[PDB]
Amino acid sequence: RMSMVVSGLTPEEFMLVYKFARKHHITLTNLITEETTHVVMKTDAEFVCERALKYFLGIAGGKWVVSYFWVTQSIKERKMLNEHDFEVRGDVVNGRNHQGPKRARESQDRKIFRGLEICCYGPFTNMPTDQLEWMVQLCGASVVKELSSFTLGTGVHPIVVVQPDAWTGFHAIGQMCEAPVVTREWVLDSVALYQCQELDTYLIPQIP
Ligand code: NI
């Protein structure tokens, strides 16, 4: 029926969400999952939040990604207000007005990574590899675990995703396969906007 997680709240703030939850009989969990219907973000007054993992996974799953004002306003009026009317407009990274949560909310047929094969390659910080994988697989990509496991042929498109920082060689990936190499920001920017970005900005230089 209805299930929520929260992001960027103080315990005090969390308490009000639980209050909201009890009142309306909304489920409340710590981990976002398949079932999660709602993601409550701490935003500023114009509905701009931090770019948190729950934010990415919420957009990726076509959920409601709603400002915490949905909660406090709904408590202030003893009624559950319009999820539509509080939705997140953007974030500190991708701009204050991009409206990706809704793009994703409606565009579940035209998924930004339809047709792609993605290998999240090497080591990653601030975000478990499997959650990034889950994220791209939620956006309609096929996940590959080994550079050598890419589906040779055409009609399909492989991409290697890395986070440069994380390694003590990421220019010498092209020596091991025939795919564009891009940074994690390709995915993250793409997911935040729910618009597949052009690799240009994100391509990493590969040695012959
Ligand atoms: Ni093509």
Curated annotation (Swiss-Prot):
Phenotype when changing residue 107 to A: No effect on in vitro phosphorylation by ATR
Record note on what altering residue 91 to G does: In BC; uncertain significance; functionally impaired in vitro
Effect in UniProt of substituting residue 14 to S: Does not abolish ABRAXAS1 binding, but abolishes formation of a heterotetramer with ABRAXAS1
Post-translational modifications: Phosphorylated in response to IR, UV, and various stimuli that cause checkpoint activation, probably by ATM or ATR. Phosphorylation by AURKA regulates centrosomal microtubule nucleation.
Superkingdom to which the source organism belongs: Eukaryota
Effect of residue 7 to F: In BC; uncertain significance; functionally impaired in vitro
Phenotype when changing residue 127 to R: In BC; pathogenic; alters protein stability and abolishes ACACA and BRIP1 binding
Result of changing residue 51 to W: In BC, OC and FANCS; impairs protein stability; functionally impaired in vitro
Substitution effect: residue 41 to R: In BC; uncertain significance
Record note on what altering residue 67 to R does: In BC; pathogenic
Outcome after substituting residue 54 to M: Abolishes interaction with BRIP1
Limits of the BRCT domain: 1-88, 108-204
Effect upon mutating residue 134 to C: In BC; uncertain significance; functionally neutral in vitro
UniProt effect for mutating residue 184 to P: Mildly reduces affinity for a BRIP1 phosphopeptide
Effect of residue 118 to S: In BC; pathogenic
Cellular compartments annotated: Nucleus; Chromosome; Cytoplasm
Consequence recorded when altering residue 15 to K: Does not abolish ABRAXAS1 binding, but abolishes formation of a heterotetramer with ABRAXAS1
Record annotation: effect of changing residue 58 to A: In BC; benign
Mutation effect (residue 132 to P): In BC, BROVCA1 and OC; uncertain significance
Outcome of swapping residue 98 to Q: In BC; uncertain significance
Involvement in disease: Breast cancer: A common malignancy originating from breast epithelial tissue. Breast neoplasms can be distinguished by their histologic pattern. Invasive ductal carcinoma is by far the most common type. Breast cancer is etiologically and genetically heterogeneous. Important genetic factors have been indicated by familial occurrence and bilateral involvement. Mutations at more than one locus can be involved in different families or even in the same case. Breast-ovarian cancer, familial, 1: A condition associated with familial predisposition to cancer of the breast and ovaries. Characteristic features in affected families are an early age of onset of breast cancer (often before age 50), increased chance of bilateral cancers (cancer that develop in both breasts, or both ovaries, independently), frequent occurrence of breast cancer among men, increased incidence of tumors of other specific organs, such as the prostate.
Record text on subunit structure and interactions: Heterodimer with BARD1. Part of the BRCA1-associated genome surveillance complex (BASC), which contains BRCA1, MSH2, MSH6, MLH1, ATM, BLM, PMS2 and the MRE11-RAD50-NBN protein (MRN) complex. This association could be a dynamic process changing throughout the cell cycle and within subnuclear domains. Component of the BRCA1-A complex, at least composed of BRCA1, BARD1, UIMC1/RAP80, ABRAXAS1, BRCC3/BRCC36, BABAM2 and BABAM1/NBA1. Interacts (via the BRCT domains) with ABRAXAS1 (phosphorylated form); this is important for recruitment to sites of DNA damage.
Domain observations: The BRCT domains recognize and bind phosphorylated pSXXF motif on proteins. The interaction with the phosphorylated pSXXF motif of ABRAXAS1, recruits BRCA1 at DNA damage sites. The RING-type zinc finger domain interacts with BAP1.
Role summary: E3 ubiquitin-protein ligase that specifically mediates the formation of 'Lys-6'-linked polyubiquitin chains and plays a central role in DNA repair by facilitating cellular responses to DNA damage. It is unclear whether it also mediates the formation of other types of polyubiquitin chains. The BRCA1-BARD1 heterodimer coordinates a diverse range of cellular pathways such as DNA damage repair, ubiquitination and transcriptional regulation to maintain genomic stability. Regulates centrosomal microtubule nucleation.
Record protein name field: Breast cancer type 1 susceptibility protein
